[PDB]
């Protein structure tokens, strides 16, 4: 017998103790080695309610990634008040590694195995696991990168789609690569990301079709963000320790969703950033020399739907919704912690 409970989880990973890469370093002291003998047990005739939007595992992951970033990033200067803090800022080795979250004695993680589970409500096929799968703590906005894919159809996740204040997480069933590079050796901050537009627009078409299922049949249209800091009006991510900000206007092209080869998004590597962890600005050193390149899988999209639209027969979605916790939610949605009684 068990019931929904929160408890402090621990983490596990395949971190190498000799690595310099900062996630490895962190995990070497914060986590144990990945479960050498993972056991997943199918719970017969058990239906369980899940709610990815109220899941303390998300809170705990957020706390760990904040801690990882706090101890790993080395900004030349950190601005918070009031307080200007200067320090050495050598370039670091930065490449997220998968982290597993595991329950301590007397608790277990239930896992939802329903192929098209949207993140809330009953799950009919439930198993128990000692640890989650390995989740890379990729911090990004607009586009979810390097995550898992939905098994079957594209899934729309939201605590309530009719509620425009709730972020929408689109879970792709096919990834689309995004290939970002700051070429070797003008302007060393200028970069760009290349996306195969043919593949992208196809997927985006499929996304609009799933959204259409949830919204009557309304015309689904994408628009650029209505406002916000650069971290949320651009697709923001960290590649090789450098902070990229890429303009995604071309990625949400309604004309090509109603016509493309390669889409190249203009990016900038920024030294002056707003920190995701806690309010405050940071300044980093100029980009490292050489070819800087990250090829990532787009595995999900965060969206916000325009409110007030009862005149129109359309629904309008803009990239961006929510906060970095939703990145973890996008991977933790299928899990919940339960206490054994």
């Amino acid at each position, epitope marked *: 017998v068990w019931k929904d409970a929160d408890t402090t989880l621990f983490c596990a990973s395949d971190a190498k103790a000799h690595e310099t890469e900062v996630h490895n370093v962190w995990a070497t002291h914060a986590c144990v080695p990945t479960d050498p003998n993972p056991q997943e047990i199918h719970l017969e005739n058990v239906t369980e309610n899940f709610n990815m939007w109220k899941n303390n595992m998300v809170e705990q992951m957020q706390e760990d990634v904040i801690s990882l970033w706090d101890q790993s990033l080395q900004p030349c200067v950190k601005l918070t008040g009031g307080s200007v803090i200067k320090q050495a800022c050598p370039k670091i080795s930065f490449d997220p590694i998968p982290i597993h979250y595991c329950t301590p004695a007397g608790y277990v993680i239930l896992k939802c195995n329903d192929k098209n589970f949207n993140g809330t409500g009953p799950c009919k096929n439930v198993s128990s696991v000692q640890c989650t799968h390995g989740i890379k703590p990729v911090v990004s906005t607009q586009l979810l990168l390097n995550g898992s894919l939905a098994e079957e159809e594209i899934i729309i996740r939201s605590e309530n789609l*009719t*509620n425009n*204040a709730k972020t929408i997480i689109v879970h792709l069933n096919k990834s689309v690569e995004i290939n970002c590079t700051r070429p070797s050796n003008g302007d060393i901050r200028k970069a760009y990301c290349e996306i195969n537009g043919t593949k992208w627009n196809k997927v985006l078409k499929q996304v609009t079709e799933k959204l259409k299922e949830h919204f009557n049949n309304k015309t689904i249209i994408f628009q650029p963000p*209505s*406002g916000g800091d650069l971290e949320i009006t651009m697709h923001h991510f960290n590649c090789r320790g450098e902070f990229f900000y890429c303009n995604t206007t071309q990625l949400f092209n309604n004309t090509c969703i109603g016509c493309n080869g390669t889409i190249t998004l203009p990016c900038k590597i920024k030294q002056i950033i707003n920190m995701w962890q806690g309010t405050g600005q940071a300044m980093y050193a100029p980009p490292i020399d050489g070819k800087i390149n990250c090829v990532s899988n787009i595995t999900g999209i965060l969206l916000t739907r325009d409110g007030g639209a*009862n005149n129109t027969s359309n629904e309008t979605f803009r990239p961006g*919704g929510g906060n970095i916790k939703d990145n973890w939610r996008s991977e933790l949605y299928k899990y919940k912690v339960v206490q054994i009684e």
Partner: antibody
Amino acid sequence: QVQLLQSGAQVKKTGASMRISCKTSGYTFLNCPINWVRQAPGRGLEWMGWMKPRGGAVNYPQKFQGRVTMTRDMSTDTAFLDMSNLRSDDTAVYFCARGKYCTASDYYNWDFEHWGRGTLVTVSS
Amino acid sequence: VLTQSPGTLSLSPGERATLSCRTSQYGSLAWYQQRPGQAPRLVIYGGSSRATGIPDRFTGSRSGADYTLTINRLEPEDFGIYYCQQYEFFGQGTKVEVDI
């Protein structure tokens, strides 16, 4: 005690811009959206949008896009409503409002238990 | 989205005011009271829950898409315009006229 403190009435010529502040206190500003609602004669109460202090994400109905900007000053826990190119029919009492339920991990935006006192903006030649 | 009725209610203290809001869409329904020259005040949320400090003579109920706010034992200070709300949308308001 949650408090939403609005700035004072304003008078504007048509074509001008206005800016109204809503200084919040009594809770963690970051944790939930701020909303603006205007009370314009003949038009009851009309929601103008929300703004999340984290990142300053916003959501505006289409009719206000291009003229409304909702912004914040994180250092003073203050939200702002800016509206440009004012016209006569922008004359209204402007309220900021916040949901009843707001925690570090969850909120429900729309049960507006908390309202600023309102800011009259009259737009007139 | 939200249709209120009647437009105006003109009642004496001690009487019962029955305010209707008809919805066309999904979502939690709230009622507000707005007295003249004052901010609106939340009265009911989630169709039937009473907001902080709202006297118990205010009650919200729901029948299918039809929501009602009943104000029993009306008082002069109940004068005002009452709005129903669902997410960002507000009804057009029902004016309750009551005085000493």
